[PDB]
Write a protein that binds this DNA or RNA. Structure first.
Lengths: 46, 94, 271
RNA sequence: GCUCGCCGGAAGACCAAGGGUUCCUGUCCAACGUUAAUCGGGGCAGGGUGAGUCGACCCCUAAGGCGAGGCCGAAAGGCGUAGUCGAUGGGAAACAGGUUAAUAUUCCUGUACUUGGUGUUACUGCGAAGGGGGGACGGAGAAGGCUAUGUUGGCCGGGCGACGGUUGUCCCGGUUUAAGCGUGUAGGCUGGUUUUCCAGGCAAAUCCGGAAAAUCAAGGCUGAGGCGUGAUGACGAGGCACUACGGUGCUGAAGCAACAAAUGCCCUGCUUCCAGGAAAAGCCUCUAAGCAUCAGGUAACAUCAAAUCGUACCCCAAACCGACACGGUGGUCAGGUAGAGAAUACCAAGGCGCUUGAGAGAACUCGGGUGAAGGAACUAGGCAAAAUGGUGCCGUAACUUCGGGAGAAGGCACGCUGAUAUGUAGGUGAGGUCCCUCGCGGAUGGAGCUGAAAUCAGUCGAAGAUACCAGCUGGCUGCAACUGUUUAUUAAAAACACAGCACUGUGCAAACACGAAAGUGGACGUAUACGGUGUGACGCCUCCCGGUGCCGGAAGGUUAAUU
RNA sequence: AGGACCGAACCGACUAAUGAAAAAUUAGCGGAUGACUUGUGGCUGGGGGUGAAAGGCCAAUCAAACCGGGAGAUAGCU
């Protein structure tokens, strides 16, 4: 059965990666929040 | 024209292994560990100056670091650049 | 000519082709072509703005000349061509100076026919001249509304406009709708009817044909649930409401012209 | 190790995606592995990924994204021009063999190619953000020419049979060889060459386009395959020396022909159809500003250059997505016998026996087999099973929109052997002989090779479409015309859609829709068009305006802000 | 020629019996040149999308997704 997650690296990056996040204000905010939290992996970026 | 200083920094070590030995013996090709940033030409230059030996050609490759586990904690070894440097016919290297 | 297809399968039974042999069997004039990608009836916001558009065949855009400005140079008609972008047929013409253009093929036109734009040009089919120069009572197509703009009225397969009157700086057109409309007399117009008049006799004959023309299916409001359309819901088939668009506006009869800027030019509305 | 069994259009081989060391070697067996484990995709250590020509990067663009100014918006921000990004598409170049425990079009051996500089001598119009060409394109169909590949014969090497026969019309194996360079064929496209002029191609153009005129019927472009060379080489069945039983070193015969043949190539072709079928660069060409006897261009030749990153391994799976060593997952390769076939059966190459076994042979459950007589009596319902099942030929009703219905129904023939005919009809096609504008040419010729289908005669069986494979049929009737679509995971239908029909709106800055707006879709469309609504092929058809809507009217009554 | 026919791949899911499986199995079944199917990338966003329309689908979630916040909502009820 075709399950929901069907990985594709480029797609992932474009969607969720650092640059995408940077591009918008909300993305930036998210990043900031993550930083505040103390996340080790700030984004999906490898 | 590569700088002397740069050249010295390029070459990290000789690589000892069965394959390397074979290369040395049969094909007249030395297997070096080199700086990850070191391009082929630079490597060649280093070889020529620092070992005093004519170079036919340099093949490089990047070796990826193995992931290991020291007890409970996970940790990755560093990547490093290997270079097969083929010396010209009759060139004997110390 | 129209051709009723033999019923060798259902979905071919009711098909009627409109087969013109005089069209060019060949690749069109490539310099006048350009790319024309499909919308899916969706705007820059990415939302569907006009339902039921989608798919259909890839099509190039033939660059048709509706402005029709080569004044004084006589052109000769090289060939008639199929245009997928319109109900009419187009005609590749060749001006004496070596330029080619596509035009709407008018009714009588065929390969070898000479045509001409300009004030001086002969009042014959395919020739183009300002409506002050065109005799009253004549049938015209590809009619400009603003001088210099390009033909906007009567472009469709078997349309034409009657010049009913010329009163000073304006002329009154009897448009195909039945609307009588004032238009500046310096606005250009091509003599005769536009070509492909048996276009309306074609019958698609199956669902697939429609699809091929880029038309997705249309669901009836009454078949929906109330959350979707004003007509939705009802156990079994109910419909106890005045017909309306998906956005609640009356559909059977309610007029929607609001343009107060061009009310002056409309002599009489259609009926 | 020897048997046995299973897959073989895969359960084999090679990739992409995704994973990220799972690869190979040594070593260890606590845990992990549904049991044991000496084994492992487990633990620990070490090793392993070699590129000018494969892929990325790179040049070019599509959908789309971002977007200087800009337009718009309380703010945030939205849209968008110039531009700049974006492959899933376009763009230079490598093949064969050998090798590692583990890499190879990457190493080695041989033999190649590419496009850049730099320098040269030789020549002499070069030059783009511009012009033109080209690139550059659909579906279906039909062949014909080919090859991959296979079969048989020849050849070469080996064999003479654990049991009757087996020196022959006998048995086993092999019989392979690239890119490149040269040739330019089957075949496809197009008339060429020169001269003159011209409101066209944002300017110019010797280019393209258009007009004339002259003269020659062959000119050019394209093109699989074959042939030659590449190759006195390589590989080569197996023999022979050493042996850490893993292998290593030497050696090496023949290496042809015919027939069959793709869904691959010629073919981005041809024919045809309507639903009318990307873009931009590379590439070719034209000039402008310019420069002017300099640069630049093409000419060969020399030299230098091609960096960087990926390359292990899994990849229909125990390594990816499914919590698991548990269904899903795009591309490429496609042997034999039978067969229409990529179906099916048995096999090859290759890969596996699915990580608990051993007994026993109760009830009951699951999955199968057979069944006296009866044959739907079962049951809500013939649910399920049983049956039908192939090719050829004969034959086939109502009704019909004249296409259908129809594979209607129903029947007959079917193996093997011999003969017709030591193998026919056909297919293919070598020598020889003749012609010739000479070649991959044309004629004639028929050797050899291949080869159905039929008829007649015999013959075996209970049974010849013998297995696997492979329609059940007919009669009346509701609904929906039809092919389609639908409740991912209890509903596939009579529901939705549909061609068709009707009403209605909409004159273009269209109605309408998404947007505080700018704008965008509608549409680069223009009433034979577009939107909405209902109805739903085709046939025969299809009173009430009092109520509620809509349309038109505006005499009077009533009536807001305002005053 | 064909939204033509029979039929593998491929796409589906009508009948049947039966956790390996949070929808599968085996045996049959429908479509199979098209209103087909499929890879890669793109776009549409929550009273919003998309919908051959079932209130279907929008990450095992849908008559209004998920995450965090208002928030210790309120609970004459248990």
């Amino acid at each position: 059965m075709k399950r929901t997650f069907q990985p594709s690296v480029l797609k992932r990056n474009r969607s969720h990666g650092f640059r995408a996040r940077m591009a918008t204000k909300n993305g930036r905010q998210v990043l900031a929040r993550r930083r505040a939290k103390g996340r080790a992996r700030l984004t999906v970026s490898k | 024209m590569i700088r002397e200083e740069r050249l010295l920094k390029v070459l990290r070590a000789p690589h000892v292994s069965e394959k390397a030995s074979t290369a040395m013996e049969k094909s007249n090709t030395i297997v070096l560990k080199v700086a990850k940033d070191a391009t082929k030409a630079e490597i060649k230059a280093a070889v020529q100056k620092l070992f005093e030996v004519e170079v036919e050609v340099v093949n490089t490759l990047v070796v990826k670091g193995k992931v290991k586990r020291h007890g409970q904690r996970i940790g990755r070894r560093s990547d490093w650049k290997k270079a097969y440097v083929t010396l010209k016919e009759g060139q004997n290297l110390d | 000519a129209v051709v009723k297809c033999k019923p060798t399968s259902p979905g071919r039974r009711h098909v009627v082709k409109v087969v013109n042999p005089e069209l060019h069997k060949g690749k069109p004039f490539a310099p006048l072509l350009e790319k024309n990608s499909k919308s899916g009836g969706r705007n820059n916001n990415g939302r569907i703005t006009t339902r039921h558009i989608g798919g259909g065949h890839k099509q190039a855009y033939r660059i048709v000349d509706f402005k029709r400005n080569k004044d004084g140079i006589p052109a000769v008609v090289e060939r008639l061509e199929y245009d997928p972008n319109r109900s009419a047929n187009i005609a590749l013409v060749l001006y004496k100076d070596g330029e080619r253009r596509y035009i709407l093929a008018p009714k009588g036109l065929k390969a070898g026919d000479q045509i001409q734009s300009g004030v001086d040009a002969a009042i014959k089919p395919g020739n183009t001249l300002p409506m002050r120069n065109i005799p009253v009572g004549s049938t015209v197509h590809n009619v400009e509304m603003k001088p210099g703009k390009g033909g906007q009225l009567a472009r469709s397969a078997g349309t034409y406009v009657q010049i009913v009157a010329r009163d000073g700086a304006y002329v009154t057109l009897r448009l195909r709708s039945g609307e009588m409309r004032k238009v500046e007399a310096d606005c250009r117009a091509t003599l005769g009817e536009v070509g492909n008049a048996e276009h309306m006799l074609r019958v698609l004959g199956k669902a697939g044909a429609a699809r091929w023309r880029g038309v997705r299916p249309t669901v009836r409001g009454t078949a929906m649930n109330p959350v979707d359309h004003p007509h939705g819901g009802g156990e079994g088939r109910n419909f106890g409401k005045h017909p309306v668009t998906p956005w609640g506006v009356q559909t059977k009869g309610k007029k929607t012209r609001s343009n107060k800027r061009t009310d002056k030019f409309i002599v009489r509305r259609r009926s």
